[PDB]
Amino acid sequence: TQNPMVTGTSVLGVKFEGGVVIAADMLGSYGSLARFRNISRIMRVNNSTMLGASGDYADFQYLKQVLGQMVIDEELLGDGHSYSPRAIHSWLTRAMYSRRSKMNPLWNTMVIGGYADGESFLGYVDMLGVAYEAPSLATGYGAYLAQPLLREVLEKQPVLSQTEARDLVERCMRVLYYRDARSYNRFQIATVTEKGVEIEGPLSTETNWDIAHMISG
Amino acid sequence: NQYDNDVTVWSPQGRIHQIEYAMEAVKQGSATVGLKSKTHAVLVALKRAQSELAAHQKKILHVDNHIGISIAGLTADARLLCNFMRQECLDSRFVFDRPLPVSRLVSLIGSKTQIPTQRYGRRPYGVGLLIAGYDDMGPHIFQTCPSANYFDCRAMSIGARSQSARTYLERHMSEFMECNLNELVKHGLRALRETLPAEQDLTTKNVSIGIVGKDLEFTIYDDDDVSPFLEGLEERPQ
Amino acid sequence: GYDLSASTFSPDGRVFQVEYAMKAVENSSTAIGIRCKDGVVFGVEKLVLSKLYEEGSNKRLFNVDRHVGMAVAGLLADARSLADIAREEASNFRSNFGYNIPLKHLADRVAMYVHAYTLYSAVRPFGCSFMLGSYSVNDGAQLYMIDPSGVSYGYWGCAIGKARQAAKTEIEKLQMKEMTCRDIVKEVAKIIYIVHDEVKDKAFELELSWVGELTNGRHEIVPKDIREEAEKYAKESLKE
Amino acid sequence: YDRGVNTFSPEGRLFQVEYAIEAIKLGSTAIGIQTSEGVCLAVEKRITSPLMEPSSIEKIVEIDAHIGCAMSGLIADAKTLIDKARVETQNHWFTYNETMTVESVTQAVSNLALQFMSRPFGVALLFGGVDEKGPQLFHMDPSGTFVQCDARAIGSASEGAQSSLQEVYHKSMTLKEAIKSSLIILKQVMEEKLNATNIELATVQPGQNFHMFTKEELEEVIKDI
Amino acid sequence: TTTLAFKFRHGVIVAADSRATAGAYIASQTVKKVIEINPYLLGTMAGGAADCSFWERLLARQCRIYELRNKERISVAAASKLLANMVYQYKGMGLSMGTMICGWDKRGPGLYYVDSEGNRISGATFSVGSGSVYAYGVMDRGYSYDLEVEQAYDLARRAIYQATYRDAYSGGAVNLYHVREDGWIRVSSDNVADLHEKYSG
Amino acid sequence: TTIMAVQFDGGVVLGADSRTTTGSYIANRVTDKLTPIHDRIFCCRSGSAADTQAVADAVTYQLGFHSIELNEPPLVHTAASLFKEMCYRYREDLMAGIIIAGWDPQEGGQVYSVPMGGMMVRQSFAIGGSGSSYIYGYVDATYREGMTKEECLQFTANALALAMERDGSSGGVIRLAAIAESGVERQVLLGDQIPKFAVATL
Amino acid sequence: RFSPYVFNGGTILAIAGEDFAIVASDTRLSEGFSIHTRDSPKCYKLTDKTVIGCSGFHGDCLTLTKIIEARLKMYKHSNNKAMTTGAIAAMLSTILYSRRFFPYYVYNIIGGLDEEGKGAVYSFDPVGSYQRDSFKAGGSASAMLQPLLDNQVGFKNMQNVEHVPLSLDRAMRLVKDVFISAAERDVYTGDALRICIVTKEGIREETVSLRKD
């Protein structure tokens, strides 16, 4: 993929006590056109891992197809071994570096969340193979708009609850719908705990437009 | 009689005799023993020297920080398969940054050795392996066969005169689980001693030990690092 | 002679290598499979040669997909290989067409891979027969068996191995088209206990697997509480 | 079962690989001895005519400034494996900028015997050199089997020479004494008058490189016999 | 960068700067630009340091194998044509190398200039780098095949000094070698700030 | 180009214009951009004619072989997936926008759009081409779930008429097609049959 | 259009002594004018005697270290010993020239112990030209750190001075003083300072905070 055609904007991520949460809008934009408005960009990887992606949706479908068969083939052996989230993270970093090195990249930037053996995982991988780990992520214009809100809370309270993390996520999406132009007020949230991967349906933020009456004000 | 000179030929009774003959090459190597507790997995071998004034042949090999093998059969097949294992483990650490499970390595070994059994112009691998490792499912002991078959085991001995060690292990299986490391190594050494004549006994020169566990990478103890494990053996009469 | 290659005919149009490869299946332990009204059930007579082998070694029931199971009898390395081929067939099918492979189609694709080994001088035929079994809401329950020659037929009940005759003579008694899976489990265990001979070979393990409504098109090993409840019925029905 | 290297005997044997071993006894005998002062190598040349220049009979060769080889068996196999060892010792220098050990040279040269080329190599080699671990002597066999040895004899009269080394060897020797012992053993397995053209001799000490002896240095040890 | 080499009665002299540079920044001032290929051959570095080092180490790897196979030390012309034919297979791909091969063989003192473009020239005077033009003058007015050894040392030292004085990408120390029939020998490593004092007053 | 597809309970409806341009010259004014892949699976074709025609022929080959060797009628998802693999594996070499509409016993009437990059997504109504930009609002303000065959034909004709009236690279004839278990009906609207809308005079 | 490189900040430093060796780095990772994370150290332990620093494009930093870790195990398998600092350096010199026409945009510094216990520092280019040194800086602030090291370690442009050898306690204070100043003028030098000391007894680590601006 040398140029993207149908794209997805920011994905968010933040840890909490006993899990991770990811959020992403349900839009695929064709340039400046909102063309597909009920696509899911969050993926149901095995019960310890989930995935969300920004960028070219076709490449995200390709990865959705490959990882699915990987996980299936892992399940078919039946021997008590499963791919941790860190393994999926490393495999994606390799898969994108190898495509970068052939100049046929995968035009994606994604957020991996997981929970295994009591510790949480949140990971990043770019088109080029740049990967890292943080308690808070945001791709695209999220990195300018939302991540300042996540970090400011995680320096005054490094350990969060599921409820506070959900509130913070919804606040960040409220800001992204305001100041990003390729956004949409219908999004999904996915969460990992010991219970596993639980995706929520189309969610909307309530928006305030009181500043519109300040012409003379 | 005359369905024997090729591996792609069945007999009227439904057998391939070249594979059965390759299995007889494991009986030509020195004896090895493998056993496991719930925390550790042990391999003890008995090394053999060609000339008296030379060094003893090395029987145990390092494959990764959590897997190791002891070999009985042809040396060349062992040296090829060990180099296969090592690269298959490096390939797993490179991609996933995790250690490769042992079941998924022995499955690959079987898939590899199955080809010479079916296509002509290649020889069956005349080497048997006992594979000791430790992963997220505990300790493991695996036997691998020239027939491209493999078994998961509580304990096993292979090589010349290994039925004695097998008979020993078969009546002490009920103890190995809650045994500590010293007792487990001693059971292995006694099963190995049961393969010798009454003339000979175990010695620093002709004993190698390989251990892997939760808090222990695969280490090998060869000549003077073995003498802690020998101290404690009852001097058996006959 | 006329019986040393699979590229060779005899004066009466027979290929004896392919028959000698079936002679190897006849000398292996017995597996059966029965197609119920709402699923399929596999049972295997798993022999334990030594007490040093763990409980779970030499598994002869394989998961080839998340809706397909496989039971084998013959050479076991050959069976593991053919399982690996049956897995990449179903993998590439989903990769190219985007849905789960049917079993009539998977059976054909594996049968042809097996038949290709009956034509050449550089290879022998496979030394294993095997059954496949699936369940779907549209396609329903299905059971196919594949032989070394490359033949593939559908079944309501089938057996492979030593006690093939003795096992089908018991399976025809069953009115399998009326019953459910939990009731056919008892029958599967009963047949495996009837045909097993303790004097001809040592103790054995019973190995079972399922696919149907009660697993939601997911091929599963039978739980322990049901396998024991069927092994008990097998013992109590041996009073005959 | 005897012909072909892809065919097992009913007892699990490879008779072609053993017949490759039997091709070593058709070569003249060579001896290698360890010592904490260094290693020695001593061989018979088997000159067939006074017309042939015996310096064109390469039975001891330099692999590097710290490793020397002695061979017995087929000439072609030896040329191949010696070129392999020389190339590997320098690829190692190019990559890591250090000296390969004798164990690793032997390990890398034995890996070609693990390739059925369609025929086993009909040649055995002794590798004598000095490493971080001191002087080391190794022995490679057509099966690709290699092992450290304190003293080893290969070739025609390997049995008697080995049956003498086990008596004259101890792990306290000097190099001048081991050189004397090797030539005394070599004297007894020859129906030709030992002289300074019927033998080669080399040494590899720690503070000195590989050094093949000369006619002068050879005669000055033949005299004390 | 500045290198020079001339062959005279008593062998070949080799001198060089010690500076490396990435644009305007001075990364290193302790660089060994004379490459000890073998105990009987010397090289130089000008252009791609990674190209100079890699391909001359590869040259050493072939020279040693030559000596082992043939039991004779290679010639200087052969050693030069190996390198030339090796770097000619990467012509236009973007290698940058300028290097002199110096040594003594059965023909006498030898000096050969090899470039990645494909030049291969024999001569009695060469200089390579940005400061080559500033060394050529001094080394041309001061040359004589009948020079003495200390005079040759002084000439090379002062030519490198005068080249470092003007050129901006040249400086540091002056590492001087001497090729002979018994191999080569390192002579000096003199900081330019030292020689400034003695050659001023 | 202006292509369009709609699903109702029984099956689907398809629609397309008839213009093929080379710059501003109309090379073919009676083009047939509807294409039978199978008995009950159709393709609405947009983009480069060469690339899309070739992809259609290849997918027809694939699906015929597949359906004969299975001996059951193929799915719409299957053809859509083959289109996806070809349009994604050769996305740097093809300019191909596709809509796949048809009927299948398992899931019934289905609509799958496969834009240039080769992503696939099921839809209730799908519009594609160069004139869809001018009717993205009309089809959103007029679509209603629960429409029958005739109401969907009306909807699809009214939309394409507008897209043809405004788009320069679209015009001529509205080629419709309805697909269901019974069969495949095909209409051709031309002249006064094409819907007319008020053009302001003041 | 697609450019396959990006500069993710980074700064690395190494000093050698007679019985020790330090390799230090910042922990900030950047992307243009933004900050990815403030916990991403550029130092990696290879053996008990050797440490490496890596700065530049982060994908190559991740790939190359894995390649090195996979080559160390192969060396140990074939030669039955762990590698030396010079052998690792000369191997990396070839691993880098393997990509002479598509290089690893990585600035490398190795720091460890010689074979008699002395310190050793090897500095690399992206294409494998290496150089043993006493001290070297690398990364975005390399132009800012090396003058003060030339002064306070090499004793350059300072007359009538005590040419005392650098002890560990002095070197560590010096290492902290240079990052404290590079965090004031360089915008890529960031949040924390990791310092990995190498000695005959093993390898330590120390974290020291810097200003988050």
CSV table of N, CA and C in Angstrom, one decimal, chain C residues 75-123:
chain,number,residue,atom,x,y,z
C,75,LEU,N,-0.2,-46.3,10.3
C,75,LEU,CA,1.0,-45.6,10.7
C,75,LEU,C,0.6,-44.2,11.3
C,76,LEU,N,1.3,-43.9,12.4
C,76,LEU,CA,0.8,-42.6,13.1
C,76,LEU,C,1.6,-41.4,12.6
C,77,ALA,N,2.8,-41.5,12.1
C,77,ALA,CA,3.5,-40.4,11.5
C,77,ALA,C,2.8,-40.0,10.2
C,78,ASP,N,2.5,-40.9,9.4
C,78,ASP,CA,1.7,-40.7,8.2
C,78,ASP,C,0.4,-39.9,8.5
C,79,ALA,N,-0.3,-40.4,9.6
C,79,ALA,CA,-1.5,-39.7,10.0
C,79,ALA,C,-1.3,-38.3,10.5
C,80,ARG,N,-0.3,-38.0,11.3
C,80,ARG,CA,0.0,-36.7,11.7
C,80,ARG,C,0.3,-35.8,10.5
C,81,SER,N,1.0,-36.3,9.5
C,81,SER,CA,1.3,-35.6,8.2
C,81,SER,C,0.0,-35.3,7.5
C,82,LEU,N,-0.9,-36.3,7.3
C,82,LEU,CA,-2.1,-36.0,6.6
C,82,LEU,C,-3.0,-35.1,7.4
C,83,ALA,N,-2.9,-35.1,8.7
C,83,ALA,CA,-3.6,-34.0,9.5
C,83,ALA,C,-3.1,-32.7,9.2
C,84,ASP,N,-1.8,-32.5,9.1
C,84,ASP,CA,-1.2,-31.2,8.7
C,84,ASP,C,-1.6,-30.8,7.4
C,85,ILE,N,-1.8,-31.7,6.4
C,85,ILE,CA,-2.3,-31.3,5.1
C,85,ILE,C,-3.8,-30.9,5.2
C,86,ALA,N,-4.6,-31.7,5.9
C,86,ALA,CA,-6.0,-31.4,6.0
C,86,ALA,C,-6.2,-30.0,6.7
C,87,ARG,N,-5.2,-29.6,7.5
C,87,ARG,CA,-5.3,-28.3,8.2
C,87,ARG,C,-5.0,-27.1,7.2
C,88,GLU,N,-4.0,-27.3,6.4
C,88,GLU,CA,-3.7,-26.2,5.4
C,88,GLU,C,-4.7,-26.1,4.3
C,89,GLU,N,-5.3,-27.2,3.9
C,89,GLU,CA,-6.4,-27.2,3.0
C,89,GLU,C,-7.5,-26.3,3.5
C,90,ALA,N,-8.0,-26.5,4.7
C,90,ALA,CA,-9.1,-25.7,5.3
C,90,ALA,C,-8.6,-24.3,5.5
C,91,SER,N,-7.4,-24.1,5.9
C,91,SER,CA,-6.8,-22.8,6.1
C,91,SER,C,-6.9,-22.0,4.8
C,92,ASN,N,-6.4,-22.5,3.7
C,92,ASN,CA,-6.4,-21.8,2.4
C,92,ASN,C,-7.8,-21.6,1.9
C,93,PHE,N,-8.7,-22.6,2.2
C,93,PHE,CA,-10.1,-22.4,1.8
C,93,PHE,C,-10.7,-21.1,2.4
C,94,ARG,N,-10.5,-20.9,3.7
C,94,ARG,CA,-11.0,-19.7,4.4
C,94,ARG,C,-10.3,-18.5,3.8
C,95,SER,N,-9.0,-18.6,3.5
C,95,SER,CA,-8.2,-17.5,3.0
C,95,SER,C,-8.7,-17.1,1.6
C,96,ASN,N,-9.2,-18.0,0.8
C,96,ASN,CA,-9.6,-17.6,-0.6
C,96,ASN,C,-11.0,-17.4,-0.8
C,97,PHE,N,-11.9,-18.1,0.0
C,97,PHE,CA,-13.3,-18.1,-0.2
C,97,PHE,C,-14.1,-17.5,1.0
C,98,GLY,N,-13.4,-17.4,2.2
C,98,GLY,CA,-14.0,-16.7,3.3
C,98,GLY,C,-15.0,-17.4,4.2
C,99,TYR,N,-15.0,-18.7,4.1
C,99,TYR,CA,-15.9,-19.4,5.0
C,99,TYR,C,-15.4,-20.8,5.3
C,100,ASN,N,-16.0,-21.5,6.3
C,100,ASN,CA,-15.5,-22.8,6.7
C,100,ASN,C,-15.7,-23.8,5.5
C,101,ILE,N,-14.7,-24.6,5.4
C,101,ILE,CA,-14.7,-25.6,4.3
C,101,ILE,C,-15.7,-26.7,4.6
C,102,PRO,N,-16.5,-27.1,3.6
C,102,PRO,CA,-17.4,-28.3,3.9
C,102,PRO,C,-16.5,-29.6,3.9
C,103,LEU,N,-17.2,-30.6,4.4
C,103,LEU,CA,-16.4,-31.9,4.6
C,103,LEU,C,-16.4,-32.8,3.4
C,104,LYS,N,-17.5,-32.7,2.6
C,104,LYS,CA,-17.5,-33.4,1.3
C,104,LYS,C,-16.3,-32.9,0.4
C,105,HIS,N,-16.0,-31.6,0.5
C,105,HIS,CA,-14.9,-30.9,-0.2
C,105,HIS,C,-13.6,-31.2,0.4
C,106,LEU,N,-13.4,-31.1,1.7
C,106,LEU,CA,-12.2,-31.4,2.4
C,106,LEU,C,-11.8,-32.9,2.1
C,107,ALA,N,-12.8,-33.8,2.2
C,107,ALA,CA,-12.5,-35.2,2.0
C,107,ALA,C,-12.0,-35.4,0.6
C,108,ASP,N,-12.6,-34.8,-0.5
C,108,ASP,CA,-12.0,-34.8,-1.8
C,108,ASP,C,-10.6,-34.3,-1.9
C,109,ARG,N,-10.3,-33.1,-1.3
C,109,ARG,CA,-9.0,-32.5,-1.4
C,109,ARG,C,-7.9,-33.4,-0.7
C,110,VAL,N,-8.3,-34.1,0.3
C,110,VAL,CA,-7.3,-35.0,1.0
C,110,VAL,C,-7.2,-36.3,0.3
C,111,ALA,N,-8.3,-36.8,-0.2
C,111,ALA,CA,-8.3,-38.0,-1.0
C,111,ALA,C,-7.4,-37.9,-2.2
C,112,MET,N,-7.4,-36.7,-2.9
C,112,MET,CA,-6.6,-36.6,-4.0
C,112,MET,C,-5.1,-36.5,-3.7
C,113,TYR,N,-4.8,-35.8,-2.6
C,113,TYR,CA,-3.4,-35.8,-2.1
C,113,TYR,C,-2.9,-37.2,-1.7
C,114,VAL,N,-3.8,-38.1,-1.3
C,114,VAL,CA,-3.5,-39.4,-0.9
C,114,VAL,C,-3.4,-40.3,-2.2
C,115,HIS,N,-4.2,-40.0,-3.2
C,115,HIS,CA,-4.2,-40.8,-4.4
C,115,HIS,C,-3.0,-40.5,-5.2
C,116,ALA,N,-2.5,-39.3,-5.1
C,116,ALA,CA,-1.3,-38.9,-5.9
C,116,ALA,C,-0.1,-39.8,-5.5
C,117,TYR,N,0.0,-40.4,-4.3
C,117,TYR,CA,1.0,-41.2,-3.9
C,117,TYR,C,0.9,-42.7,-4.4
C,118,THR,N,-0.1,-43.0,-5.1
C,118,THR,CA,-0.4,-44.3,-5.7
C,118,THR,C,0.1,-44.5,-7.1
C,119,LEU,N,0.8,-43.4,-7.7
C,119,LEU,CA,1.1,-43.4,-9.1
C,119,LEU,C,2.5,-43.4,-9.4
C,120,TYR,N,3.4,-43.2,-8.5
C,120,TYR,CA,4.8,-42.9,-8.7
C,120,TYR,C,5.7,-44.0,-8.2
C,121,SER,N,7.0,-44.0,-8.7
C,121,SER,CA,8.0,-44.9,-8.2
C,121,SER,C,8.8,-44.3,-7.1
C,122,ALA,N,8.9,-43.0,-6.9
C,122,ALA,CA,9.7,-42.4,-5.9
C,122,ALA,C,9.0,-42.3,-4.5
C,123,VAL,N,7.7,-42.7,-4.5
C,123,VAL,CA,7.0,-42.6,-3.2
C,123,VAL,C,6.2,-43.9,-3.1
